[PDB]
Symmetry: D2
Subunit: 209 residues, 4 copies
């Protein structure tokens, strides 16, 4: 645009009409409630996994997103590239809180399913999730041999679902449960960034890291 655009105090103080919440407010809202099942999306919700996706694109689809359909990419992505995935502090706080409550923690992902996967171990290790609270990662999808995200949220009777994408929130709404938004990091390679709060959902403050 212009070289010296400047600014004004109206622009400096302008706020989008979003419902922000803190981990502490979420915990307070669960007080007295018995252990329950809760779910987390993985990519850009608990793990900054862009490193692997970046290398995958560079390796199999420099000029496109075809790598996401390449089975060769997924074998490596689900079996080791998450060693380069950075865990989010927001997720750490949320998981620690649910662990203290004794809730059952599930991880649901849209990643293509592979024969083996080391993601479940990476997650349990990174977030120090006790055995009684950990559950193997769930690969949701359309495939005839797998259930959809909505189906899994219902089957496991998850009462809360955390995610950064619009489909994460709509799935929660579709099931009639509480969908909570996590901010996607600005340096994520999955762009453009989604509009957190676009469904009137709660959005966790400072959850980009």
């Amino acid at each position: 645009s212009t070289l010296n655009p400047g600014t004004n105090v109206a622009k400096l103080a302008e706020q989008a009409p979003v419902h922000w919440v803190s981990v502490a407010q979420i915990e307070n809202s669960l007080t007295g409630r018995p252990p329950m099942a809760v779910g987390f999306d993985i990519d850009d919700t608990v793990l900054f996994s862009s490193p692997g996706f970046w290398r995958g694109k560079k390796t199999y689809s420099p000029d496109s997103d075809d790598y996401l359909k390449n089975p060769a990419f997924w074998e490596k992505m689900n079996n080791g590239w998450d060693e380069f995935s950075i865990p989010k502090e927001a997720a750490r706080q949320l998981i620690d809180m649910h662990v203290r409550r004794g809730d059952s923690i599930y991880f649901v992902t849209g990643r293509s399913q592979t024969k083996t996967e080391t993601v479940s171990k990476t997650l349990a290790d990174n977030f120090h999730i006790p055995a009684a609270n950990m559950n193997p990662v769930i690969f949701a999808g359309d495939k005839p041999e797998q259930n959809t995200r909505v189906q899994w949220l219902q089957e496991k009777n998850m009462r809360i679902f955390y995610g950064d994408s619009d489909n994460d929130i709509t799935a929660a709404r579709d099931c009639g449960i509480r969908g909570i938004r996590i901010l996607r990091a600005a340096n994520s390679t999955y762009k453009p960034l989604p509009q957190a709060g676009a469904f009137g959902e709660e959005v966790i403050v400072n959850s980009e890291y």
Copy 2:
């Protein structure tokens, strides 16, 4: 820091957000779809009017050293019968008032200002915000009592379902009554300091409502 010449900053601090429930007028309006006409209330000072000019002159005239002017009947006479000619209407309030007029709601103004024999505040409000006679109601001067919230009785008796205000006591009054209390941001240049912590009771706060 105030003692730090070049404090600098970082992206974590730049993007940092307070956990507040922000709402827009449109969202409020939408949340009232299907609701029949109802009674709603508005605080006056720093909610619908930036009245600091008159309170500032009042302090300088009667209590330059203190806030005793607020207990001076001479001050209230001047404040309620003319000084609001210097009071600037808030745009956020214009939008709320128009929205409620469209719905056909009865609008009330409940203020902590002291009651005076005569008052021109009601007219200033009706003229500045173009409030039809059908929706307008004379201002209720509830006064301000120590250890007691004067607004509660009025919200109950007039059966107000929503109450807008910038001060904590406006929100706690709505909470005491079990109705929806919505916060309006007090301007940074208001002479009524310190600024309150909007969202301190988990209430909805209207975005960009400082002007």
Copy 3:
């Protein structure tokens, strides 16, 4: 649809390329320099005078800005209505700083001149400016029998000029001196707000009040 526009972390952290400064930094930049002459714009720079201008318009030109040409308005505005004007904290800090340095303070305004004025008095009293550093307000304009803003900056050899409007900054620029921007409050009746920093000038932080 757009009832919930939401937001994202890129937008939350976005910054306009503005050269922000604080009063302490300004003070530090003047260390060792002998006392000098500095000038201040009045409206929305040192005084939030919108109350008087608002009443002026509603009284003399409820449909336009013609009131700005009405001598009856200026008689009221320059002789008492500033008793309703709110002094700015940023200005207070700047003036105290310059007084400490022993600088000579001047106030230049584009307000129409009147045979008498009590503005100078209101300024000296509100800001406790000692007689030694105080100077009667200077009224400038394109009009006759008057010197323009630029002419007054040159004649008094003002080395710094503080203002909220673009012409305050350009005037300083035209005289080769240091022009520093003050933010105009969002509730000022003089709209639209200007783009502070539009000339690459220094802008004082939190100077809207």
Copy 4:
């Protein structure tokens, strides 16, 4: 403190920092002949935390002792940057300098290894022409290496970009223009530095 709230003074509050854009930097160089400019690497042009994270988890999960482990650097400098995400802000600065015909140098505090593929990763990701590219320079306080300051002087760099305090003070020591880049909030190198602490120019939106 469950509901701390906020106020408009807080919402509009600005830190006294000198912000600049790539366009303003380019404008300030108008009419200047080609010159040498240098860039720090980690968190300046590359979000290299993925590699440092794996290194930490592998060699010293409870500390930063891995930064002094030779085995770590061998892998970091020879392939782990394939997981390093280039920064858009750097992409713009580099294109800008390449258009000017300036000579670009990359100076890093990473431990030097026998071989390195970092220079290759940089040239490819940022499509730097052969005419403007220079092999990465490893600066160090070892009698075999030259310090960061010496390299800046040696190559007569006029501008140095970096996210760290020592990147800025190095430029200040050489009497050249040191410009700050914002370290991403999710970098594993914490705490984040205070950009602007030396009254230096800081590039807006440079966290990605």
